[PDB]
């Protein structure tokens, strides 16, 4: 549905569910495949910026175990919104088809290589190096790249060892979610 | 005295003083100029490894304001031992003569460029780029490079705003300093 893109309505449902599970110590499993946000004036006039921040906050605030699996696409700011490891996640696995980037190869090459000759060669070079899960994994964004058939067993193992995990957070009178 | 090198005796005196000042909310000011550790069997047989860890711990544990000024040399592991910014420091200033490196240019070039022709050119290139305070500052190791005449005023300003600073640390029954 809608290429797996985030919009206002999806952000509202996600943030509410995540917030409940965190409050009552229920671990979270995230399956990420998101190419970006739904474009258009229907979303911009509706406050897509304000509403998208709801899901980002709901994950960032969480203190319960978070296990993320990236199945195919994670472009742009949506990578971090869908519970990336940099929001105090516990484990993050990629399948062999995962691709983590600011944008797809076509947009990135047209912007990076502007006015140069032999752009088609630059397009092939960029895709071969960046259109896979490796530029993120070699940086510590992904803990392992796993065969999909092993996903269940890998998650079960993490759940049975993160269950006793506690973290500290500064004192606050109460949270201030963007609303 | 002894080129400003750390040894067993200096580590013992430092750790004890730092620990007292931290316990009773007295800010710390550090003036760093340390080329490394005193070599030789007299120090190795005396447990220089064990004793040096005392000063590293004493700074790392501290929760009171820490302001560090680097005047000239900070080579090797001694950089971090003498209250570097990466031990939860508040501010760290360098004077124009500061040099932060793993080792001096002579040792580094002989190790990096081994068996190559025109080593003398490599020596000049290395010194011009790394024998100054810039490769550390551009990475976030140093907050500013200041004229020495302004040091006092800069420190006074930091002390009058860090005085109300509190940090959180996980619960512990009691500390376990290497001894
Ligand atoms: C064709 O150029 C339309 C591109 C839309 C691709 C998807 S839709 C939502 C995401 N936002 C974006 O700019 N690209 C993604
Ligand atoms: C001559 O080669 C002796 C070099 C000693 C220079 C100083 S003394 C202590 C520090 N340790 C080290 O390897 N170099 C520094």
Which one of the ligands is nearest to B40 CA? 2
State the alpha helices, DSSP H only, in A24-172.
Answer: 41-44, 48-60, 78-81, 105-112, 119-130, 134-137, 151-162
What is the distance between the alpha carbons of residues A135 and A30, in angstroms, rounded to a whole number? 21
Q: Which of B63, B167, B168, B169 is most worth mutating to test chain A (most A CB atoms within 10 A of its CB)?
A: B168
CA of B170: which chain A residue's CA is closest?
Answer: A168
Min Cα separation A169/chain B (Å): 8
Question: Is the shortest distance between the CB of B5 and ligand 2 below 6 Å?
Answer: yes
Q: Within an 8 Å CB–CB cutoff, is residue A149 touching chain B?
A: no
What is the distance between the alpha carbons of residues A127 and A125, in angstroms, rounded to a whole number? 6
Q: Within an 8 Å CB–CB cutoff, is residue A168 touching chain B?
A: yes
Mutate to test the pocket of ligand 2, among B39, B104, B105 (most ligand atoms within 8 A of CB): B39
Cβ contact, residue pair B170, A168, below 8 Å? yes
* Helices H / strands E in chain B, number of each: 8, 5
Among candidate residues A77, A67, A54, the one with its CA nearest the CA of residue A175: A54
Structure determined via:
cryo-EM
What is the distance between the alpha carbons of residues B32 and B82, in angstroms, rounded to a whole number? 6
Q: Within an 8 Å CB–CB cutoff, is residue A170 touching chain B?
A: yes
Domain borders along chain A are: 1-179
CA-nearest residue, atom 10 of ligand 2: B36
Residues of A in contact with B168 (CB under 8 A): 168-170
Q: Give kind and range of the element (H or E) at residue A73.
A: strand A66-75
Report resolution in angstroms: 3.0
CA dihedral B111, B140, B177, B4 (to 10 degrees): 60
Min Cα separation B171/chain A (Å): 9
Among candidate residues B34, B165, B16, B35, the one with its CA nearest the CA of residue B91: B165
Cβ contact, residue pair A170, B168, below 8 Å? yes
What is the distance between the alpha carbons of residues A64 and B169, in angstroms, rounded to a whole number? 19
Among candidate residues A66, A129, A68, A116, the one with its CA nearest the CA of residue A93: A68
Please answer whether residues B83 and B30 qualify as being in contact, where contact means their C-beta atoms are separated by less than 8 angstroms. Answer: yes
Q: Which residues of B60-138 form beta strands (DSSP E)?
A: 66-75, 91-94, 99-101
CA of B171: which chain A residue's CA is closest?
Answer: A168
Sequence-distant (≥ 6) Cβ neighbours of residue A60 within 8 angstroms? A87, A88
B118: left (phi over 0), alpha (psi -120 to 50) or beta: left
Min Cα separation A167/chain B (Å): 8
Distance (Å) of CA B127 to CA A23, B13, B95, B142, B156: 56, 35, 18, 20, 34
Residues of B in contact with A170 (CB under 8 A): 168
Among candidate residues A98, A83, A106, the one with its CA nearest the CA of residue A29: A83
Token match 């995540």: residue? A18
What is the distance between the alpha carbons of residues B133 and A101, in angstroms, rounded to a whole number? 34
Q: Within an 8 Å CB–CB cutoff, is residue B166 touching chain A?
A: no
Half-sphere exposure of B77 (CA within 13 A, CB side): 10
Residues of B in contact with A169 (CB under 8 A): 168
What is the distance between the alpha carbons of residues B128 and A62, in angstroms, rounded to a whole number? 48
What is the distance between the alpha carbons of residues A114 and B93, in angstroms, rounded to a whole number? 41
Min Cα separation A170/chain B (Å): 7
What is the distance between the alpha carbons of residues B65 and B26, in angstroms, rounded to a whole number? 8
CB–CB contacts below 8 A, A to B: 5
Three-class secondary structure of residue A178 per DSSP = coil
Residues of A in contact with B169 (CB under 8 A): 168
CA-nearest residue, atom 5 of ligand 2: B39
Distance (Å) of CA B86 to CA B73, B92, B152, B168: 17, 10, 23, 16
CA-nearest residue, atom 15 of ligand 1: A36
- If you measure from the C-alpha of residue B120 to the centroid of ligand 1, how many angstroms do you get, rounded to a whole number? 54
């Amino acid at each position: 549905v809608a290429s797996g893109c985030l919009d206002i309505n999806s952000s509202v449902k996600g943030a509410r569910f995540v917030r409940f599970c965190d409050a009552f110590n229920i671990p979270l499993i995230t399956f990420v495949d998101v190419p970006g946000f739904l474009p258009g004036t229907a979303q911009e006039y509706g406050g897509i910026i304000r509403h998208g921040a709801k899901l980002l906050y709901a994950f960032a605030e969480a203190t319960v175990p978070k296990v993320t699996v990236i199945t195919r696409k994670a472009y742009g700011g949506a990578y971090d919104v869908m519970s990336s490891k940099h929001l105090c996640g516990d484990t993050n696995y990629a399948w062999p088809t995962a691709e983590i980037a600011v944008m797809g190869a076509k947009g990135a090459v047209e912007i990076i290589f502007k006015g140069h000759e032999n752009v088609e060669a630059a397009q092939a070079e960029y895709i071969e190096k960046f259109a896979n899960p490796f530029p993120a994994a070699v940086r510590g964004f992904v803990d392992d790249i796993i065969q999909p058939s092993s996903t269940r067993a890998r998650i079960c193992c993490d759940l049975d060892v993160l269950a006793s995990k506690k973290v500290q957070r500064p004192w606050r009178k109460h949270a201030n979610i963007p609303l």
